[PDB]
Design a protein around this ligand. Structure first.
Ligand SMILES: COc1ccccc1NC(=O)Nc1nn(C)c2cccc(OC)c12
Ligand SMILES: COc1ccccc1NC(=O)Nc1nn(C)c2cccc(OC)c12
Ligand code: NI
Lengths: 235, 241, 244, 237
């Protein structure tokens, strides 16, 4: 009813924080999890983490900005493990950052669509950027990235829906990660001040949401961006 | 996990469709489920349905537009079953484009009336889940569009505001905005009108009451503890606003 | 101590001896909107909730060469609305431009938004008969100036209401729009200290507070024949500072 | 002063419809109007149209997808006519993705290039014109919603970056406008369309233009980051 048994899940940028937590959550729901990183040591770290948590799968090196890397990586997964029917995009000034992030969502999403099309089933879930950056530049970039993600996600959902593939996004707020743990105190406090719940979110709390979107029970949810921000809305 | 043992859940308008499906889903997750209706026969029906599905709880008559009814109904639940920490608001009242105001004005007043009443219990427990269910697309033309967009936008704003006011107490407030769900309206449409309808839905199909329910089920859980102020669309990719 | 007060040459301004009702016109934004519509040549009835406010409105219009009147109107009251419109109809003519700027203030967010929307509806509904007969109309709703919770709520209530109404009365060539102000320079903001001012300005791209007059120009353009295809819209006037 | 005397305005894609109407409107408000097209005959047509309407300015060939063409064209305007302080982007240079990606790249390319002049003058108006509903049905809805949402986010981001220089950046999101697309509808097909528009009519190119005309002015100096819908009450998101 809430299981992912027999499903292969690709999770990009799974070596740390949110990506790692998503990889462990999909594993717990019984998915076979391929987590990726951009380096060999990261791929092996991913592999050791899955092992030590009893999750089947693999760590591999993937560069999401490269067609060659995407194409070859998929070929690898297809030959060895199977066709990924769950894909979580978590692998990443303002214009180039959003332009490049969306180009890579598209590049990767397009590549996995052939497999989901053949299976008449799929879950693509895009993870947004965490709140955290410094001053007004952080605010501008964050709002832009989020709005880019919300529009892209809806458009894609609309294009691939007749095949029973859902496309959704998770827009995190102020989350406790390695990046946020070492923020200056005042930038941390200011941010807590804007959060109704009065606390930072855990990586795990993003992961549960992804977990539910991956499931059969979220089969009528598509085109949606689920904010996970403790009531803090920054636009 | 996702588990609701030891939790009492109030589900308003639980006699049919979405409300019924939510009541059964919360029950399945182990909640003690009080479903309500506006009539005695509806309360009876709710009770028979819960019984026949092995869900503990009750069917009660509740009129959400009445302070007396709200106050008395809560007292009854408190004395007999316990303090509801999960509350799902699904009780709302030739469709034209001038009906929107009455409908939205009335529905929001009653969300507020009911939400305010259960907050005392959730405040004391330092935990809570309020989940507001939006209206299904009620009709097909322009009047249908206007009313639906208005109800949804009223629900989105209300939900966010309330989430902001009660968040420091670890109470989350969220909404589910359904799309085209299989309703008697959607069943007794003309045939040519039905395919045209499906054509405007990327998924190419009507949604099941159960699919709304799973979403509510997840919002009720501990894993949705950092989700608040959100409106989760459940519409198969069909966005009317 | 009257509850109504007053204020060949042929003008050639965008508003054609069109009659405009501007609620809450005694100060700031409302006053500025009343003067702007007047400058565009409208006959301006500004309202307040007290006799002295209506007097002040009338003196202000006079001293700026705007024809019209200051009237006492309570927008939360059907009696007051109904009677006030009758009075404008009998004496001055049918208001085809209406700017809603009368909102009260202080579990409070709900009552403020609930009450303000009920009054927008009450007043809008009442003027619609006149605009229907004339096959033309402009309703413009002014949002609240900036706290965060209340502002985001008021704004979202206004955006949805405005759009729904626009949809209901569009076939009659009546447009309905809103203006969502940001941080506007007022008496409340002028007396912010040295320290609290910079922090505020820092969150505004333009690096400055908005003037009441800048809201007014926007209303002025929405009132005109050139904004005839704009309806259901909420125009943010906030210097790039977006809070939701 | 809701006028534009002594101001130079660049209007891209000014040979027909919305772009043409914007060029004439800015001219009427007293601006010196450089309208552009992607072909020589279009630049010619632009020049003859401005002349016959008493508007000062020029018709130029500009390809907005090309850095060479942008750079050279600005250089030509600067040397010969002056620095454009009002710029209206109206040029259009798994369809949805490439269209929006390419449109935004070209808004950025062009916006960046004119910013030097506006930065120096400490004043500027960039106005981005969205796409008209391009077809009916599902593909039409998807592409239109995507273009619009891309335009709304971009416009807000840019407004944020250049705001301290007193440059405003806004967008106009047209609905169903009377242009070639709607002019060639069948009979049953157009009434159905009008039925979904509260105003019960198509918009005129001129009505987009008045809105741009107001955004260009001093009275819209506190409006920035905004997308003004001009759609007769017909909202497709
Ligand atoms: C007033 O209730 C609110 C509290 C906080 C945030 C939003 C709202 N309400 C709204 O956003 N909208 C509406 N509130 N009410 C009472 C309405 C009545 C008719 C139509 C409405 O919005 C389309 C609203
Ligand atoms: C470059 O895109 C942006 C820059 C600044 C702020 C927002 C955006 N992007 C968007 O809002 N949307 C989209 N941007 N891009 C490059 C897109 C590509 C395909 C679909 C898109 O959203 C509809 C966007
Ligand atoms: Ni030369």
């Amino acid at each position: 009813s809430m299981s992912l048994q027999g499903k292969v899940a690709l999770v990009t940028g799974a070596s740390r924080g949110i990506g790692q937590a998503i990889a462990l959550e999909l594993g717990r729901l019984g998915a076979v999890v391929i987590g990726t990183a951009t380096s060999a040591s990261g791929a092996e770290k991913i592999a050791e983490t899955l092992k030590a948590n009893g999750v089947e799968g693999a760590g591999l090196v993937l560069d999401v900005s490269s067609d060659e890397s995407v194409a070859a990586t998929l070929e690898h997964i297809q030959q060895h493990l199977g066709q990924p029917l769950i894909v979580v995009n978590n692998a990443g000034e303002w214009f180039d950052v959003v332009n490049t992030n969306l180009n890579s969502l598209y590049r990767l999403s397009k590549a996995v669509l052939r497999g989901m099309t053949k299976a008449r089933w799929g879950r693509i879930i895009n993870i947004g950027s965490v709140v955290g950056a410094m001053g007004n530049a952080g605010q501008t970039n964050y709002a832009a990235a989020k709005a880019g993600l919300e529009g892209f996600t809806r458009a894609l959902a609309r294009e691939v829906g007749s095949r029973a593939i859902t496309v959704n996004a998770v827009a995190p707020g102020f989350i406790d990660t390695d990046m946020t743990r070492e923020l200056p105190e005042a930038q941390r406090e200011a941010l807590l001040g804007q959060i109704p719940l009065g606390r930072l979110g855990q990586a795990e709390e993003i992961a549960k949401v992804v977990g539910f979107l991956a499931s059969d029970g979220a089969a009528y949810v598509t085109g949606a961006t689920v904010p996970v921000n403790g009531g803090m809305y920054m636009s």
